Design a protein around this ligand. Structure first.
Ligand SMILES: CC(=O)N[C@@H]1[C@@H](O[C@H]2O[C@H](CO)[C@H](O[C@H]3O[C@H](CO[C@@H]4O[C@@H](C)[C@H](O)[C@@H](O)[C@H]4O)[C@@H](O)[C@H](O)[C@H]3O)[C@H](O[C@@H]3O[C@H](CO)[C@@H](O)[C@H](O)[C@H]3NC(C)=O)[C@H]2O)[C@H](O)[C@@H](CO[C@H]2O[C@H](CO)[C@@H](O)[C@H](O)[C@H]2O)O[C@@H]1O
Ligand SMILES: CC(=O)N[C@@H]1[C@@H](O[C@H]2O[C@H](CO)[C@H](O[C@H]3O[C@H](CO[C@@H]4O[C@@H](C)[C@H](O)[C@@H](O)[C@H]4O)[C@@H](O)[C@H](O)[C@H]3O)[C@H](O[C@@H]3O[C@H](CO)[C@@H](O)[C@H](O)[C@H]3NC(C)=O)[C@H]2O)[C@H](O)[C@@H](CO[C@H]2O[C@H](CO)[C@@H](O)[C@H](O)[C@H]2O)O[C@@H]1O
Ligand SMILES: CC(=O)N[C@@H]1[C@@H](O[C@H]2O[C@H](CO)[C@H](O[C@H]3O[C@H](CO[C@@H]4O[C@@H](C)[C@H](O)[C@@H](O)[C@H]4O)[C@@H](O)[C@H](O)[C@H]3O)[C@H](O[C@@H]3O[C@H](CO)[C@@H](O)[C@H](O)[C@H]3NC(C)=O)[C@H]2O)[C@H](O)[C@@H](CO[C@H]2O[C@H](CO)[C@@H](O)[C@H](O)[C@H]2O)O[C@@H]1O
Ligand code: NA
Ligand code: NA
Ligand code: NA
Ligand code: NA
Ligand code: NA
Ligand code: NA
Ligand code: NA
Ligand code: NA
Ligand code: NA
Lengths: 594, 594, 594
């Protein structure tokens, strides 16, 4: 049948008739060529017209149904990896159908079906002014009724290009990859670019999912208009999941005001080793009660480490909230090894610059460690703080950071009156000098709170700034109890005010406080050991004080150390070599219970 | 010969007769189809019966000999990568033969032969109740006589499933990958699951090997029975080797009592960026003298950083030991950036909770830096410590950590009496408040040692805990010399005991100590400058003291500062505006040589 | 035409006549075998003689033109990935031509053309004694006229072997991969070995380039002769670029004196997670004004974290410089989590050992944070320092490090006289004890500078070292102002000198200083409250002092605290129970404005 043989060979079954054995090894399987070819699969195997003839991709070709067919087919065989070939741009030109339609989905991902994107995937103008989620892992329009997406990995050296199209309306949503209720899924190596989107990738769905990761990806120019309501490049909404070694860049002015790189919203999540430029915000670390279904109502074991950022707003934002029925809690957080600066901008030209923000809208944030970070803002940016503490806080600890910005602790007066507990600012935090001389009328630690309890503020300057009103100021409206507040004397000799308690709160029974002050004293006339007393009676709270001044006199000396008396004078015993009433003005370290 | 031509084409040599040139490029090599196919290799090329017909894998098919044949064949050509295809589960049903038999080996790995596991590898019930090591890189039953395994990489999106089978006896061993005397080997991307094993991966053999790594792997439910004697998921037994970005999870109760994620046992080894849940222990960092053959008897440059863990026992365990002939030493260790909690459990229901443990069974551990970590244990877990110091220590330094647990330093009285040198607890360690009010009868730093030398403990509270017996207590049995022990006054005003030296050890010539105390004093009756003396004679050791109390009196003041006298009284000079014997009880900061 | 059919099949077009459809799927594209084969490409498709017959690689075969042809061809189709097959060594035996010739180039890389190196690439002896750059991404002999290289990735399990050939002359250059003006390029997984080269990889060109990375690579024995002038394994000369998780090893003696692992020379660059053995230096972090064209004249956001190193010289070297026209600035640097030791060597046998060096040859270095690192040098290495501060510094901050070496701060007297600003050494830096008893004639902090301003040095010992001359010494030639210098008393009771100011600089108006001293005092004879005065008149600068000694006497007590008098005596009020002139020698804490 040698006519039939030639016909068979040229037919689509022809490769199934040509035998093969690996490297002529007689111990190897006797196969057909088609068997070996069938070990791999690409978009070319599905990118064909109804008569089976291949179609070249391009801007007038909608590749969506072909990729979907490929995905569908490989899913039917228990999975595999589909290559999107290099050297070609594959345009997407229509919405998907079925369970992804509720999500404005283009492509449905399926379990165990990996995409090796080596070429480029580009959105056609069909999508201009419309919502879209390019890859969707949900299988139901209602995520609560969705099955899971498992073991789906997107990787390669290729690109997803969003076509530069602006949002049509603020209320729209746009996404690159929504993995859905996603278990062991990942994106590695891909560049996402040239868009106006809400997110590039989302992981999980309200706590459902596990072991999802974004690694070695680039995210470039993904906000481009004033219509875009909000952008967060990666939203991590399942536990045991994270972002590592990624690069995030924006150029748009709008991004400086609206864009965040990462959301960590479930327990055991991380954001590491990544570089951010041009964004408003670095990361939110948040437990929303509305997202607590899959993994509980606590966000714990949250890690933000070893990132590099230039931002215009706030680096890390901490928060939690409630619904009628569920209480969200954020605890057990570490922020460490990050090097962050506020980019060159005018004061008040973007959201208030901060390393840590305690974001408003019942919060419960505690057990946070912020350690071994650097923060810098240029000297003109009045709105820059180590922490903007703008809502209730139940604990945050700062150790061994270097903060070089306008404020250390700040909240705006007569906005919120946060209730503050367990704010620990260790003496090993180094306060930079870039804003020296810029602080007229300002308090370095401006404690504009309802109350402060169980808190520690150990102020240590590293250079002079005599422009500042005070190192630390508590308004009379702020209650202060069971706290330690100290101001180290270095670089403070010429300051009129070091610590200010406008409500005399430092007299509290369990307030432990020390700071420098200038005190005028007068002695009795007695020759010999002689008392010196303060002229003012403002010191009923002082347990001891000691001299920070030299004694220019030969004929007498004031006391080295002082106690107080019931009338609020200080008193100490000096020495009159010759008698006479003495009158001196001395710099003292005032101490209370320390 | 056109009959012969058709026959040739359908034969196993047929692809070797069909010509090919890349993309019709006339400058390309004129090849045959078989040449291009021979560029890749899969298990399908060896998974055949004796007549060459392919065999489908499945639970009634033992794939072992076929994979071994593939490995053997590729090794003969100088190496390559064998694909274990996606969409299939490949069952292993028998032991291997030869040099791996001594190791209970299933598959022998060979140098330069990589395995790309995209499908699933599952153990058949043949292995129920038996020992096994799935992949073995030794080529001799005696590892000391083994050749090396070099340049062998196992990677992909696939899975090794251990079939859920329990151990048959405690004395058995079970492993996933033993690389052997392994140089430039790695496992990346693989999920190891559903087992009862000793290890999932071991790297090296008693110091022999180099540049072995486990990256982006998952390890899930690898302990399931009470028979399992001990589990450590990755054992690193060669230098210049490590674990990074991995995920470790257990669900079994037995795992909470026996399972550790990593062993770092040779120099220049690391454990980074990984997430652990459900394990007893995080990592051992140990030099066993018995393992010192390949790389010397020092474990140095050991790094445990930026991990996330929920454990039930101890995070990092430090140790070393000796044989008759060889002395093991552990030095130059860093533990940093880790965020760790003891999981919800009853007190004493698992091994004692600790961030650092100094593990018993001559140790030599020194030059350890523990910095910028968080640790948390729930308030009910009495058995929780920043360090359980249960064997000899030659040095460990703690700086800028946040420890929130029951004890800071602990050892059980009348177990061991460790000899302690160079324990440094810097003031920048922040002590959390979760266990406040839980510490009746307990010492926060319970120094239950034979001796303490060249040590620093700078206690700083961040909130009150008046339940505790003391901040720090030394029993009379503990010698204390050439040390600094300080208790900051903040939050201590109402404590009866701050530091306790049951053997009066704070009087030592080179002991530098300060802590608060209440002292009753009486003055002479003299008007004017007047001495006040303590009623008790317990202060022969005090170099100075100063007031931590206000003076409620108008008519006199006690001294601000005090020295001592030979009889052990304190003495200072106050001021009697009017004469009369005065009697006061004051809170003082007692100081010795500081 | 069945003769023609058989002929066609055996021809190079034969595979283009054999039909295929994926897995017999009738919905799949009807293709030819050649179409599926054309989805991949290897060196075999170009490694052929002029008649198209394949050539086997080997030491007598020059593979260069064949690889270049492959690269060229794939570039023409918009890119792809070329495999360099496993199981073969591919020798390079000649220079390339054209635009790479100016760079001594062998292979020209092209945009979007990736190289998957699974086999070995070896240099033939043609290259002995000659310069070479194996892979070059420039397209012009003058880099300023070069186009860019974009989207080029080199990866796999293979090896580049430099053939062991020595340099022929010091003035020559040799490189593995020069990416050129390189945007989104990377090298992953490759081992570079057995050479005498200047660099293994360079990224960027004078600030031009972006998003270039070296990951999971090994670099082994890349210096082997005394001819080699200088070696730096990776030179990062574009922003948003870095090195992570790499391994660097040298065995040569010459490497201990000349070799550095990484250069970070542009903003937003990083060096993380890597292990170094046998090198002189870890990393330079430098802004050269001569390299400022592409990305500006500031190196900012520079990160060196979580590395492991054994080196013989300096870990991190900081610098900047100028040209006639351009000023380079280095700022916003973090160095954190690194564990580093000086390898076993004789004192002065290699460049001076240091954790941080401020390298000479107008510098501008500021806003540097050095935190949470360990450093160790063996006790014999006299030339070991936490910082060698050998050129001008505008700021560096040290917090919570553990430095165990001979010096903390050092500069050699009568070499440079650096101008120092904003040097911050926080009290949380722990000073190790390995060099105790080795410091005869040495100052632990040897402040051999022109001047020191706005600086903080808080010395805290952790053990005794009475061998040292002083803890800190300022020569009379060093101006000191607006600074804080403190020496904690612990472990200092027996020291003759703690802080030394050879120019009496501690008297400065804005110098804040405290340290211990022994002081002889004499009292008046008066019974009762009685003054004690120092016999020496060296204390005009002291604001207060207090006792660090016990009082062995019953009949009197010296003052607990002292002030001074205009003549430079100290004075305080003690108590004579019985009268008589008293004479005591006491250890005091001397304080000035603190
Ligand atoms: C851009 C971004 O992520 N911003 C963060 C805030 O997130 C919140 O606003 C977003 C605005 O885009 C999201 O809401 C929008 O999308 C919702 C979800 O889309 C639906 O469900 C999807 C699964 C389908 O595919 C879609 O087709 C659609 O059906 C939609 O319901 C909203 O109407 C719309 O506005 C974001 O919603 C979350 O999206 C993730 C990712 O897709 C998804 O997994 C979640 O299910 C979904 N959550 C919920 C509850 O629906 C929404 O959360 C974020 O709130 C803010 C955190 O900071 C604030 O709150 C802190 C705690 O009080 C406080 O401290 C802080 O100061 C506050 O600013 O951070 C970013 O702004
Ligand atoms: C599970 C685990 O790793 N536990 C750690 C302890 O390791 C020790 O016990 C293990 C129990 O499973 C291992 O011993 C077992 O296996 C030995 C080796 O198997 C043989 O050799 C292999 C190469 C072959 O393939 C096998 O067929 C067989 O011939 C076997 O000899 C023992 O009888 C058996 O109990 C573990 O042994 C090491 O295994 C690694 C990995 O396979 C291998 O590379 C080494 O060669 C082998 N070492 C030796 C010396 O044989 C064995 O080390 C670990 O000791 C402990 C550390 O903490 C303790 O010690 C500290 C220092 O004193 C102390 O501070 C601390 O408090 C102590 O708890 O940590 C885990 O428990
Ligand atoms: C080995 C190394 O990298 N050493 C570091 C120092 O770099 C400087 O010396 C190098 C010696 O090899 C390089 O100069 C050499 O190469 C130059 C460039 O080659 C040319 O241009 C290439 C693009 C072509 O392919 C070549 O064919 C050739 O045309 C050449 O011009 C020089 O003559 C030659 O000596 C190195 O030069 C840089 O090389 C990189 C990587 O290839 C390239 O991207 C740059 O363009 C090129 N730069 C310049 C300006 O040409 C050259 O920089 C390095 O200077 C030192 C830093 O520390 C010192 O300076 C600090 C600041 O003052 C100071 O604090 C510190 O104490 C100092 O030691 O670090 C290493 O030693
Ligand atoms: Na929807
Ligand atoms: Na905390
Ligand atoms: Na209030
Ligand atoms: Na054995
Ligand atoms: Na240490
Ligand atoms: Na004892
Ligand atoms: Na050149
Ligand atoms: Na700094
Ligand atoms: Na000078």
């Amino acid at each position: 049948d040698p006519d039939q043989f030639r016909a068979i060979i040229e037919s689509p079954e022809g490769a199934g008739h040509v035998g093969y054995q690996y490297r002529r090894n007689t111990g190897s399987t006797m196969r057909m060529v088609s068997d070996v070819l069938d070990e791999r699969v690409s978009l070319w195997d599905f990118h064909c017209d109804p008569s089976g003839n291949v179609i070249q991709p391009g801007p007038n070709v909608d590749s969506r149904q072909y990729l979907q067919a490929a995905i569908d087919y490989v899913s039917s065989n228990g999975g595999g990896t589909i290559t999107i070939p290099a050297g070609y741009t594959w345009y997407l030109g229509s919405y998907g159908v079925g369970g992804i339609a509720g999500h404005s989905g283009i492509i449905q991902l399926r379990s165990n079906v990996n995409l090796n994107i080596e070429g480029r995937i580009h959105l056609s103008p069909f999508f201009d002014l419309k919502p879209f989620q390019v890859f969707v892992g949900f299988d139901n329009g209602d995520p609560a009724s969705s099955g899971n997406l498992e073991n789906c990995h997107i990787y390669g050296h290729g690109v997803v290009d969003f076509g530069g199209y602006e949002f049509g309306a603020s209320s729209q949503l746009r996404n690159g990859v929504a993995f859905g209720r996603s278990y062991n899924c990942s994106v590695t190596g891909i560049t996402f670019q040239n868009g106006d989107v809400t997110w590039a990738i989302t992981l999980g769905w309200n706590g459902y999912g596990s072991n999802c990761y974004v690694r070695k990806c680039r995210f470039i120019n993904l906000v481009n208009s004033s219509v875009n309501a909000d952008h967060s490049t990666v939203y991590v909404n399942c536990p045991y999941s994270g972002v590592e070694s990624c690069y995030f860049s924006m150029s748009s002015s709008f991004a400086r005001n609206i864009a965040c790189s990462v959301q960590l919203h479930q327990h055991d999540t991380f954001y590491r080793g990544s570089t951010v430029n041009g964004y408003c915000r670095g990361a939110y670390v948040v437990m929303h009660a509305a997202e607590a279904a899959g993994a509980g109502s606590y966000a714990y074991n949250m890690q933000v480490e070893n990132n590099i950022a230039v931002i215009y707003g706030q680096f890390v934002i901490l928060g939690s909230d409630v619904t009628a029925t569920v209480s969200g809690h954020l605890n057990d957080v570490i922020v460490s090894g990050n090097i962050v600066s506020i980019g060159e901008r005018a004061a008040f030209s973007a959201p208030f610059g901060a390393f840590i923000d305690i974001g408003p809208d019942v919060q419960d944030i505690q057990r946070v460690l912020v350690t071994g970070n650097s923060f810098y803002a240029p000297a003109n940016i009045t709105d820059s703080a180590a922490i903007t503490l703008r809502a209730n806080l139940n604990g945050c600890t700062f150790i061994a950071n270097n903060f070089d910005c306008r404020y250390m602790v700040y909240n705006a007066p007569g906005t919120t009156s946060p209730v503050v507990q367990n704010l620990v600012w260790d003496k090993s935090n180094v306060i930079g000098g870039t804003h020296a001389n810029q602080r007229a009328g300002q308090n370095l630690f401006d404690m504009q709170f309802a109350s402060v309890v169980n808190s520690t503020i150990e102020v240590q300057l590293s250079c002079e700034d005599l422009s500042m009103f005070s190192c630390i100021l508590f308004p009379a409206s702020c209650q202060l109890s069971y706290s330690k507040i100290t101001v180290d004397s270095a670089w403070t000799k010429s300051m009129s005010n070091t610590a200010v308690f406008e409500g005399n709160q430092q007299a509290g029974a369990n307030v432990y406080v020390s700071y420098p002050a200038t005190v005028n004293l007068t002695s009795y006339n007695t020759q010999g050991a002689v008392p010196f007393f303060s002229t003012d009676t403002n010191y009923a709270w002082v347990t001891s004080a000691y001299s920070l001044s030299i004694n220019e006199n030969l004929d007498f000396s004031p006391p080295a150390t002082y106690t107080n008396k019931a009338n609020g004078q200080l008193v100490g015993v000096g020495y009159n070599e010759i008698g006479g009433v003495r009158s001196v003005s001395v710099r003292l370290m005032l101490q209370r219970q320390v």
